[PDB]
Amino acid sequence: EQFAVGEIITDMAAAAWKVGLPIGCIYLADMNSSESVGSDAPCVVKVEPSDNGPLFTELKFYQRAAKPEQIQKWIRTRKLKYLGVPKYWGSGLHDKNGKSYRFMIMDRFGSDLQKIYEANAKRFSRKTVLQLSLRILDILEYIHEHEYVHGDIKASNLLLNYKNPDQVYLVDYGLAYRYCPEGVHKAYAADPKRCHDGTIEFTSIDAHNGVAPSRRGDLEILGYCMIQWLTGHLPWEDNLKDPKYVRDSKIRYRENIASLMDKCFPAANAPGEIAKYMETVKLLDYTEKPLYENLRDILLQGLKAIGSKDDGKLDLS
């Protein structure tokens, strides 16, 4: 344990918070009061030692790109219903037993998508996948425009709004990467400071090639997520201890998208927007800016094809 239960901690902006039970490095948290922190807590506090690299990285992301007003101004300007980027609420330093810790306050979210996926026998419907992906595309556009790539989009990093199950949020920026510091795009090479390569089954060909992640890589990761969610599988899932096999398959399947559709979907029965999205992402150069509205239009055609529309309904349960 890093905190005493009911402990009051004060962040760098002098806002006071109260610590509750773990949700062991994440606790329920709320604004300081006489009341005890309950299971209905609107916040969480993440705490790690001061020397922990991922919390520092994550905190720098939240401080630079997730301030409540910069998020609200984006939502207003882009006329969005919401933006699945968790808001930054504060951070500080905390001492315990002569050891220095860093903490960060963020909103409390509900279930991860991986649990809902596993309870639905490892399937999400076409409507769900298109609705999730439209929101993920808004999220990616936002973080990319704020000089960052996520590099690790997957169902376990996607959380529902604790009070609204039609609102999904992308979490975990511990290994996010600033691909465009001060508007200067990174070169096609490895970052010496950066070690990680994402989640093997979903990671980009760029990551497999040992180069730093860029915008096309996050869009390619979303592509593998869509197939996985729609079919319950990926062609290379039985060879995940062999990264050169996983890369070889991804390369061969990018080169011939129709054979990927033939492999993943029942014979001659593949949703067309998936192949079109993948062909679009395939045309991006390492440093090129994606045309997000074009990608979102590809998915909207998919919603039209099933006789639906972008009504923001995730259709989970």
Ligand SMILES: Nc1ncnc2c1ncn2[C@@H]1O[C@H](COP(=O)(O)OP(=O)(O)NP(=O)(O)O)[C@@H](O)[C@H]1O
């Ligand atoms: N703001 C949040 N609200 C609610 N739950 C959260 C929040 N942030 C993280 N969690 C969940 O808490 C768990 C641990 O979080 P975290 O350590 O940051 O993720 P991780 O490193 O990617 N995975 P793992 O260490 O294996 O649990 C996960 O199941 C998260 O979905």
Ligand SMILES: [Cl-]
């Ligand atoms: Cl199955």
Ligand SMILES: [Mg+2]
């Ligand atoms: Mg997390």
